Design a protein around this ligand. Structure first.
Ligand SMILES: *[C@@H]1O[C@H](CO)[C@@H](O[C@@H]2O[C@H](CO)[C@@H](O)[C@H](O)[C@H]2NC(C)=O)[C@H](O)[C@H]1NC(C)=O
Ligand SMILES: *[C@@H]1O[C@H](CO)[C@@H](O[C@@H]2O[C@H](CO)[C@@H](O)[C@H](O)[C@H]2NC(C)=O)[C@H](O)[C@H]1NC(C)=O
Ligand SMILES: *[C@@H]1O[C@H](CO)[C@@H](O[C@@H]2O[C@H](CO)[C@@H](O)[C@H](O)[C@H]2NC(C)=O)[C@H](O)[C@H]1NC(C)=O
Ligand SMILES: *[C@@H]1O[C@H](CO)[C@@H](O[C@@H]2O[C@H](CO)[C@@H](O)[C@H](O)[C@H]2NC(C)=O)[C@H](O)[C@H]1NC(C)=O
Ligand SMILES: N[C@@H](Cc1ccccc1)C(=O)O
Ligand SMILES: N[C@@H](Cc1ccccc1)C(=O)O
Ligand SMILES: N[C@@H](Cc1ccccc1)C(=O)O
Ligand SMILES: N[C@@H](Cc1ccccc1)C(=O)O
Ligand SMILES: [Ca+2]
Ligand SMILES: [Ca+2]
Ligand SMILES: [Mg+2]
Ligand SMILES: [Mg+2]
Ligand SMILES: [Zn+2]
Ligand SMILES: [Zn+2]
Ligand SMILES: [Zn+2]
Ligand SMILES: [Zn+2]
Lengths: 481, 481
C-alpha cells in the first residue's frame, strides 16, 4: 500500500530538512564517559536490522520500514569489519575478543590474541588480552554482563574469560590434558578471573556438580549440574562477597535489584541458554529488557560509573535454525533493551554502542509491497511455478525437497514461528556471514565511531572514552553532570 | 592462513590507536562544496562491499579483508533506508528519485513523487521532482552523467528525467496513448529536459531512427537505431550547442576530453549497456574510471564547480545473473573510479558521496579460511554430501537440480567468470534486497552524513553542501580554496 502523506514531495523535503537540522546540531563532547554500555546483537547484521525494523514497525501498526528502531536513533554509525585473523567469516568467540578486548583472534577462541590456537590449551599463556570490562573494574567501575545465552557462552565470556576453546563451558567439557595444564572451564573463569558485579543470563548447569537437580527442572536429569570437580561455583562466588545474591528466577531478580544491601548479583535463569522471547515463561524468566534494567539498578549505584555488556544472544540462534521469526523477534527484544537502557542512563555521561559480532546469510528480497509482512511470500511465482518467501537464507536447515521438488509455501506456513525459510544449500545450521556489520554509537566520544573500522575499534573507543588503559592520558575533561 | 603480524596484540592496538587519532582529527567544514559527486554502485549492498573488498585485496596479493577499498577510506558513513513508497524492496528508478531528487517515489518510476503511478502517463504532470544535478546546472555549475549502463537507464535517468515508466528508453517503447499525452521517452528527455555538459555511457540505439546501423556493429541489425519518430537525437543535441562533440569510442573520448574547444561531450559507447569490464574491448571502450576522468577534465573547467554522477551500473547486473564474479569485478572498477575521482578533485571543495541504490540477496558465508578466494567452496560438505560455495544468493538463476539433486560444485567451476552461484529459489533474475545500504561521504559538509537516514538524505545533503535550492540560505562560507 502507498501511504498518502508520502505522495507529497513536501513530506520528504520536510523530513530531510529536519534530518539536516539534526545533523548540524551534532557536537562532539570534550568530556569523558562515566559509563560504558555495549549492546551486542549476536548475528545482527544489516539485513537483520532492516528486517527487524520492518517487523517492529508493523507490530506497532505502522507500515514498517519508516519507523526507527531505538538503535536507528543513535547519531553515529560506522561499518565494522568482522573477519577473524584465521577465518573471513567469524565466530562469536574471536569477534568478542575484537569488540571486548580490542584485539582480533582466531575462530572459536575467546580473550586470546591470534598467537593462541583453538583447542590447544598449551598455547594460552602469554596470549591473554584483557577486556575493557576488566579494565573498567580495575578503574573502580561496577561491571555487568547480561545475556539471553549461557553467561558462559562465547560473547559474554569475551568480557572476562581467556580460553582456546569456547566449548569449554564446565570442567566436564575440558579434556583431561587441558585440565592438568590449568585451562579453566569458562564457568570457573566467570567466578575467578575478575570481580563482576552483575551476572545475568543462562548457564545454571555449568555451576553445579553432576547430579545436582536444576531448581526449575528437577525432574529433567539432562538439565542438572555438569561439573565433575564437585564444586558449587555459585556457592564459591557468594562466599567471596558480602552482599552477594544468587537468583534463578524473575521474581527474585526483581527483589534483588531493588535491595540496597545487594552489591553483587548473579542471576542464572535456565540450565543452558534462555528461552526465545516467544517461549519465555514471564512468571519465571526475565526478558532481556528486564535483566538490563535489573543490572542498571545495581550498576548505577557506583559513583565511579559502570561498564555494562548486554547481549541479544539468541538473534544468532534464530538465524542458525533458519527461523527468521525467532531471529527477528529476538532482535526486537534486543532493541527494546537498548531503548530501556537509554531511558535509564544519560547520553551526557554514558557512551553506548550497539553492534553485532557478525552477520548471517539472511536476505530480504522478492519485491514485496509496502506494509506486507516480512514473513510473507514474494509476489509472483518462481521459475518452478511455486511460491517463495521474501526472507531466505543462503544455506541452512530450511532447504527442502519434497518428492524431488522445492516445496511450495503458503502465507500461513511462512508466517509460523516454527517456519524455516528455504536456503540454497542444506546444512544442519545456517552459517554466519562475513559482511560488515553496523556500529551505532551515542554519548561522550561517540563521534569517534565513524567510517569503516576494524571490529577492534569498538573496544578501543570505549576504553578511550572512559580514559581506561591504554588511554588513561585520554586528555578528556571529567564526565559531564 | 594466519598472518604472523596479526598474532601480536600490539598490531591491533597500534592500528586502533591510529584509528582513534584519525577519528579525533576529523573536523567539520564551515565552508560550502564547490563540487558535488555522487558515486552510485547499483546493487552495491553491504555484502557486495565486503566481498569486493576481499576480492580487491587478493587481486593486490593481500589476504583480502584487511585492505581498504577507496570507499572504505571515506570518513563519514551512514546507513540509508532504500524502501520505495510502494515496495519494501525497491528498484533503481524510484531509488534514483530518492538519492538524486530527495523525494521517495514508486517502483519503476523516475524523477516523480509517489503521487505518480507506474506506466500511467496521465499521472505525470505536477509530480516532477527536480534533481540536485538540475539545480546545480541552474546555479551555473557544469554537470556530468557517467555510467556503464545505458545513459537512459533508471539510475542516470534520475538526474534529468521524469517518467512513470523506466522502460521507456526510446519512443519505440512508449505506447501510442502515452506518446499522444506527451510522455517523452528517456532518450528525448536526455537531450531536452536540461543542459548536461558531459554524458557518458551506453545507449546509442535509442538516439537514432530505426534502420540506422550502429557504428560499432553495422552488421548486427539488432544493435541499430530504435526510434520510430525519424529523429537523430545526437544530431539534435549537437545542433543546440557550440563546442559540442559526440563520440562512440574510447580514442575519440580521450581526444575530446583534452580538447579545450569541447564544452559539451556526449559519449555513447555501446548500443545498450556497456560490456562488463571483464568483456570490455579496451581499444574501443573506456572503463568507468576513464569515463570518470574524461568527465572531470571537462567539468572541472567551470569556475563555479560541477555536479557529477558516476555509476557502477552493472554491479547490479552481475548479481541479477547470480554471477558474483561479474558483480564483484564491476564493484572493484567502480571503486577504482572513486579512487581516480579522489585524485582529480580536492576534498577541501568537493563533497563526494558513495552509495548504492539498494542491495541484492547476495550472501557471503560458510567458514572460509583467511586468504581463501571469495569464489571458492565453503570448507566442509553440505548435508546432501556435496560441496557448496561461500557466495550464495537467496534466489536467482543459479538454482539447479541435476538428476533431481543439488549439483556438486568444484573450485574450478565456482571460480569461473560465468559461474552462477546457487540460490534457494529459481528465478530468471536474482532479486534486489531491501536491507539498508551504506553511504560513504567526504568533503565539505560530509560530516552531516551520519546515523540511519532515509535515502532522500543523499540528495538533500548534496544540495545543502553546495547551497543549492532549497538550501540557498545554507549559511556556509564560500568553498575553500
Ligand atoms: C601443545 O601440545 C601438543 C601435544 O599434543 C604438542 O604437540 C606435540 O608436539 C610434538 C613436537 O612438535 C610432536 O612430536 C607431537 O606429535 C605433538 N603431539 C600431538 C599429539 O599433536 C605441542 O608441541 C604443544 N604446543 C606447545 C606450544 O607447547
Ligand atoms: C524463585 O526462587 C525462590 C528462591 O529459590 C523460590 O523461593 C523458594 O520457594 C520454595 C518453594 O516454594 C520455598 O520452600 C522456599 O522457602 C523459597 N526460598 C526462598 C528464599 O524464598 C521461589 O519459589 C521461586 N519462584 C518460583 C515461581 O519458582
Ligand atoms: C489515466 O488514464 C486511464 C485510461 O486508461 C484512466 O482510467 C480510466 O478511468 C475511467 C474512469 O475512472 C474508467 O472508467 C476507465 O475504465 C479507465 N480506463 C482504463 C482502460 O483503465 C484514468 O482515469 C487516467 N488517470 C488520470 C489521472 O487522468
Ligand atoms: C572512433 O570513432 C571515430 C569517429 O567516428 C572513427 O574515425 C572514423 O573512422 C573511419 C574509418 O576509419 C574514417 O573513414 C573516418 O574518417 C573517421 N572519422 C573521423 C572523424 O575520424 C574511428 O575509426 C573510431 N575508432 C575505431 C577503433 O573504430
Ligand atoms: N554460533 C553457533 C554455531 C557456530 C559453530 C561454529 C562456529 C561458530 C558458530 C552457535 O553456537 O549457536
Ligand atoms: N524493566 C523490568 C523491571 C524488572 C527488573 C528486574 C526484574 C524484573 C523486572 C520490567 O518491565 O519488569
Ligand atoms: N534491476 C534489474 C531488473 C529489475 C526488474 C524489476 C524491478 C527492478 C529491477 C535490471 O533492470 O537489470
Ligand atoms: N584515466 C583514463 C584517461 C582517459 C580519459 C578519457 C578517455 C580515455 C582515457 C585512462 O587510464 O586511460
Ligand atoms: Ca527459567
Ligand atoms: Ca563500444
Ligand atoms: Mg553470543
Ligand atoms: Mg543503475
Ligand atoms: Zn555470534
Ligand atoms: Zn552463531
Ligand atoms: Zn539498482
Ligand atoms: Zn537491478
Amino acid at each position: 500500500i502507498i501511504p498518502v502523506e508520502e505522495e507529497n514531495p513536501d513530506f520528504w523535503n520536510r523530513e530531510a530538512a529536519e534530518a539536516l537540522g539534526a545533523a548540524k546540531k551534532l557536537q562532539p563532547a570534550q568530556t569523558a564517559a562515566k559509563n560504558l554500555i555495549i549492546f551486542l546483537g549476536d548475528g545482527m547484521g544489516v539485513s537483520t536490522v532492516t528486517a527487524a525494523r520492518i517487523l517492529k514497525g508493523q507490530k506497532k501498526d505502522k507500515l514498517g520500514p519508516e519507523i526507527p528502531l531505538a538503535m536507528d536513533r543513535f547519531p553515529y554509525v560506522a561499518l565494522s569489519k568482522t573477519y577473524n585473523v584465521d577465518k573471513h567469516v567469524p565466530d562469536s568467540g574471536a569477534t568478542a575478543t575484537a569488540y571486548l578486548c580490542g584485539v582480533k583472534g582466531n575462530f572459536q577462541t575467546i580473550g586470546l590474541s591470534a598467537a593462541a590456537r583453538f583447542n590447544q590449551c598449551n598455547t594460552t599463556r602469554g596470549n591473554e588480552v584483557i577486556s575493557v570490562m576488566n579494565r573498567a573494574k580495575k578503574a573502580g567501575k561496577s561491571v555487568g554482563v547480561v545475556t539471553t545465552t549461557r553467561v558462559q557462552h562465547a560473547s559474554p565470556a569475551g568480557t572476562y574469560a581467556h580460553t582456546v576453546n569456547r566449548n569449554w563451558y564446565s570442567d566436564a567439557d575440558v579434556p583431561a590434558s587441558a585440565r592438568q595444564e590449568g585451562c579453566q572451564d569458562i564457568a570457573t573463569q566467570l567466578i575467578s578471573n575478575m570481580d563482576i558485579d552483575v551476572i545475568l543470563g543462562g548457564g545454571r548447569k555449568y555451576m553445579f556438580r553432576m547430579g545436582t537437580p536444576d531448581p526449575e527442572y528437577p525432574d529433567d536429569y539432562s538439565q542438572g549440574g555438569t561439573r565433575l570437580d564437585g564444586k558449587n561455583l555459585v556457592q564459591e562466588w557468594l562466599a567471596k562477597r558480602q552482599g552477594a545474591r544468587y537468583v534463578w528466577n524473575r521474581t527474585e531478580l526483581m527483589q534483588a535489584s531493588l535491595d540496597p544491601s545487594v552489591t553483587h548479583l548473579m542471576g542464572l535463569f535456565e540450565p543452558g541458554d534462555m528461552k526465545y522471547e516467544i517461549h519465555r515463561d514471564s512468571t519465571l524468566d526475565p526478558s532481556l529488557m528486564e535483566m538490563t534494567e535489573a543490572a542498571l539498578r545495581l550498576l548505577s549505584r557506583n559513583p565511579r560509573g559502570f561498564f555494562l555488556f548486554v547481549e541479544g544472544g539468541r538473534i544468532d540462534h534464530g538465524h542458525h535454525e533458519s527461523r527468521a521469526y525467532r531471529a527477528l523477534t529476538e532482535t526486537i527484544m534486543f532493541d527494546d533493551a537498548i531503548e530501556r537502557a537509554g531511558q535509564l542512563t544519560s547520553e551526557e555521561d554514558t557512551l553506548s554502542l550497539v553492534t553485532a559480532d557478525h552477520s548471517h546469510v539472511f536476505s530480504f528480497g522478492g519485491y514485496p509491497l509496502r506494509g506486507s509482512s516480512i514473513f510473507g511470500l514474494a509476489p509472483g511465482k518462481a521459475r518452478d511455478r511455486k511460491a517463495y518467501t521474501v526472507l531466505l537464507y543462503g544455506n541452512g536447515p530450511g532447504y527442502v525437497l519434497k518428492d524431488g521438488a522445492r516445496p511450495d509455501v503458503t502465507e500461513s506456513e511462512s508466517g509460523s514461528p516454527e517456519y524455516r525459510q528455504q536456503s540454497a544449500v542444506p546444512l544442519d545450521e545456517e552459517t554466519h556471514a562475513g559482511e560488515d556489520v553496523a556500529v551505532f554509537a551515542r554519548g561522550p566520544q561517540a563521534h569517534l565511531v565513524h567510517g569503516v573500522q576494524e571490529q577492534t575499534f569498538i573496544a578501543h573507543v570505549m576504553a578511550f572514552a572512559a580514559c581506561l588503559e591504554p588511554y588513561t592520558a585520554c586528555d578528556l575533561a571529567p564526565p559531564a553532570g
